[PDB]
């Protein structure tokens, strides 16, 4: 009495995290008198667009795709005959890393976990679009001139490849470049086939 | 017996939880018939006869079968995994839903 | 016949308030089999659809902190465990109770019936709201001392203990007591600490 709660709950480990990759450590309230364990809570959530909507669901469905031959637990075997569907093929080294930047078993327990904590990277779609809006005088274009003069000298200094490559493709609407179309040029809803 | 008669057994159940099957202190449910069967029979009560009575007595239990707890959309009581008060009506010779 | 659904909705039922009586007294409570769901049907619901495109993305964003069994499950067994770190007590009077809206096989299709069920609730807002808004006669809050009559007096009169906590407790928006807020305070929109 006053232990029906707490031999039950050893079975919920099983499934999840605390077999498959005990980094993210929890920890067990309950002395024998109950009503004190309401101070464990999981306290603060939101910080921006953290699961990027366009980006991170349309994956988890296509679980089907990736597991073959159904059984939740993809091999290297389950990707290669996947990437094959889709167009362009990456070596066994080039994947080996890959599943060796999961610990084991890429089943639907250490997939989504893996994928769940990777934010950190690319900027979100209103910070890299307001950089030449913030920077227009009144509303009109801005001139690619400015953004040459910039580039090359007042920051971290490219090369004369690395932007003039990076430089041609773009919508010049007469000597100004139409920034958030370019700005899209560098982050919307497009390319594949690149993992997984 | 509980084949033909048809009965289920549920233990506490449906669909919200609770009791019971109240039990009864040291008195056995099986026993005390087999001492009034024997008073039947004293009396003069055939074999056939002493079933048609067992019959009839049973055809009031499942007019019941109020176990184990009062039950919404009612107020009524029904029996459970179905079944039910039919059973009553195959044990008489009218219909099921009157 | 009907045993079987019934055998179905023993697992899926479980739902709704037959031991409602963990910590207070056994009350007659609701009951029992497939007829019966349609008095169970009170008032306070609201119903959807089971395609979601993006609107729950949220289950997705935050599944991470929660598991159980990462296939797409929680069992009677999680509910003993996470809860602890995201509020009440629980206790062995109200186990099942306190369980009460999920003892069942909550696949995406009966998380459709968990969300619904926020919506239904021991008496949502259409009830719980209500209850104390339909008190004044036009933009009222619950004139506080003639609350503090009916709780001393009104059929089953009431103890010190509950007046005192409930006195430091009280919101009193300026000379009167605002229910509907210390009621509708576990919804409204705009914050994010406690509860999950």
Redesign the interface.
Not at chain 1, 1 to 6: A, V
């Given at each position: 009495?006053?232990?029906?709660?707490?031999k039950?709950?050893?079975?919920?480990s099983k499934?999840?995290?605390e077999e498959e990759g005990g980094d993210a450590a929890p920890?067990?309230?309950?002395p024998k008198p109950?009503?004190?364990?309401?101070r464990?809570?999981?306290?603060?959530?939101?910080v921006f667009a953290?699961?990027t909507?366009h980006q991170?669901?349309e994956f988890?469905e296509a679980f089907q795709l990736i597991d073959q031959d159904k059984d939740?637990f993809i091999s290297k075997n389950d990707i290669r005959a996947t990437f094959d569907s889709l167009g362009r093929l990456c070596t066994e080294q080039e994947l080996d890393s890959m599943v060796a930047e999961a610990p084991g078993p890429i089943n639907?327990?250490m997939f989504?976990?893996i994928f769940?904590?990777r934010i950190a990277g690319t900027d979100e779609e209103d910070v890299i679009v307001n950089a030449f809006n913030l920077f227009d005088e009144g509303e009109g274009k801005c001139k690619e001139e400015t953004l040459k003069r910039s580039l090359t000298t007042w920051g971290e200094k490219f090369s004369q490849d690395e932007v003039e490559e990076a430089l041609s493709e773009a919508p010049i609407d007469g000597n100004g470049l139409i920034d958030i179309k370019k700005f899209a040029q560098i982050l919307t809803k497009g390319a594949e086939e690149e993992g997984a | 017996l509980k084949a033909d008669l048809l009965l289920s057994d549920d233990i506490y159940d449906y669909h919200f939880v609770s009791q019971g099957k109240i039990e009864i202190p040291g008195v056995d449910d099986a026993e005390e018939l087999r001492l009034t069967d024997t008073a039947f029979d004293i009396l003069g009560f055939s074999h056939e006869y002493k079933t048609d009575v067992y019959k009839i007595t049973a055809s009031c239990m499942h007019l019941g079968e109020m176990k184990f707890k009062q039950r919404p959309r009612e107020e009524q009581a029904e029996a459970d995994g179905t079944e039910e008060g039919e059973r009553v009506a195959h044990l008489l010779g009218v219909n099921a839903a009157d």
């Open positions: 009495m006053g232990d029906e709660e707490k039950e709950k050893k079975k919920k499934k999840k995290s920890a067990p309230p309950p109950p009503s004190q364990k309401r464990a809570q999981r306290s603060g959530s939101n953290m699961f909507q991170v669901q988890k939740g639907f327990t989504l976990t769940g904590d | -």
